[PDB]
């Protein structure tokens, strides 16, 4: 082993893409590695930005966009160093940004 | 208030006023920094402070201590309202 508690945390601005990535990781880790509790939903940090529509005053009609940022979490009980060797080839997409322990 | 060396000056105006005060104390010297406060040494001279158009002269006296240099120079005129 020599590396217990691989606490990988994945965060993205999309849900179905992050769900696909976590499904792929849970299926690939379902091989050599064991004792991996399932995906951990997180409160999906959210913000709203509001912008006036017209180039001129027209204040009474303004719209607003929203940059959603979904969040999940994984914990790995032990490395099983061959498992990280298999892990080296995952090539996750750019939309999901990783953060391990 | 600065609360730490409260008496504040642009720190460039000190050299010429100290020089003149020790150089027979010439009255007319042109200053633009309304930013500065007066040290106790300041009393004695005149300065052609700039308001935004031209230079108006102010004579410093020991009567007051601590007040801002530029407050002696009004910048905005009075009402001068017409009838209608």
């Amino acid at each position: 082993v020599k590396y217990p508690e691989l606490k990988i945390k994945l965060e993205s601005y999309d849900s179905t893409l992050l769900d696909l990535t976590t499904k792929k990781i849970v299926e690939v880790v379902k091989g050599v590695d064991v004792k991996i509790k399932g995906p951990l939903p997180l409160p999906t940090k959210k913000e709203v930005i509001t912008i006036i529509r017209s180039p001129h005053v027209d204040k009474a009609s303004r719209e607003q966009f929203e940059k959603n940022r979904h969040k999940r979490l994984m914990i790995l009980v032990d490395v099983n160093q061959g498992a990280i060797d298999s892990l080296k080839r995952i090539k996750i997409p750019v939309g999901v940004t990783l953060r391990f322990s | 208030r600065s609360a730490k060396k409260g008496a504040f000056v642009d720190a460039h105006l000190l050299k010429k006023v100290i020089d003149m005060n020790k150089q027979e104390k010439k009255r007319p010297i042109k200053t633009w920094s309304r930013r500065s406060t007066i040290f106790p040494e300041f009393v004695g001279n005149t300065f052609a402070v700039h308001n935004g158009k031209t230079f108006i002269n102010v004579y410093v006296t020991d009567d007051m201590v601590g007040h801002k240099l530029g407050e002696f120079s009004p910048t905005r005129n009075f009402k001068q309202h017409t009838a209608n």
């Binding site: 601005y13 179905t16 997409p93 750019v94 939309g95 940004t97 | -």
Partner: protein, 215 residues
């Protein structure tokens, strides 16, 4: 006054055009203002390539610009003389430490993309072609390709003053009101000799039922 038909379905029926992230608001602004420059360079400098769109993909000092253009060879050039040139402007506008690895791929049935059709409208109008017949030829050639209804409208100086003489064209089912519609939208500025001509094209490209989410 109505909303841009692209934005309403964008992000829930259409995948984003530039997927990337960086350190929080430190230089994400830099990356956006940089890759929009690449996008503008593609849509501006090379009219002859008819680039439909560009995909920007950055992750921590790497970039890959997928492109979809009707005619790839003009971007490629003769014996690859133009690809190296265009990639060196991309580099000098992106820096030097970042790998580029651009790719160019022809787009199947490009004539169903509003971008290239609007560009063709701009080229025709700027060339003093009578606007009505150009509209009709472009409309027929687009519709024959097997698509649904079209909406092309043009404002600006229609060969003279009194611009409030604007022509509009609608030729079938194109439901803005339906979110699950798979509609395309574009816009070009046909810089005529008398001012600015804005051409707008709406393309209905079939139903997008059972999509679930973006592709």
């Amino acid at each position: 006054q109505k909303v841009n038909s692209n934005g309403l379905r964008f992000g829930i029926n259409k995948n984003w055009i530039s997927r990337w992230t960086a350190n929080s608001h430190a230089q994400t602004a830099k990356w956006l203002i940089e890759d929009e420059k690449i996008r503008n360079l593609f849509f501006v400098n090379y009219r002859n390539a008819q680039v439909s769109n560009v995909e920007i993909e950055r992750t921590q000092a790497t970039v890959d610009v997928f492109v979809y253009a009707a005619q790839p060879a003009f971007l490629i050039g003769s014996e690859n003389k133009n690809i190296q040139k265009i990639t060196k402007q991309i580099k000098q506008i992106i820096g030097r430490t970042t790998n580029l690895d651009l790719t160019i791929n022809e787009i199947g049935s490009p004539m169903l993309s509003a971008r290239i059709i609007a560009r063709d409208l701009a080229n025709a109008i700027e060339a003093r072609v009578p606007l009505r017949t150009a509209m009709r030829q472009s409309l027929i050639k687009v519709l024959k390709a097997g698509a649904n209804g079209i909406k092309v409208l043009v404002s600006g100086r229609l060969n003279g003053a009194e611009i409030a003489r604007d022509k509009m064209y609608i030729e079938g089912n194109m439901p803005l009101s339906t979110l699950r519609a798979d509609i395309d939208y574009a816009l070009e500025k046909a810089q005529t000799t008398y001012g600015v001509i804005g051409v707008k094209v709406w393309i209905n490209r079939g139903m997008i039922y059972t999509k679930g989410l973006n592709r």
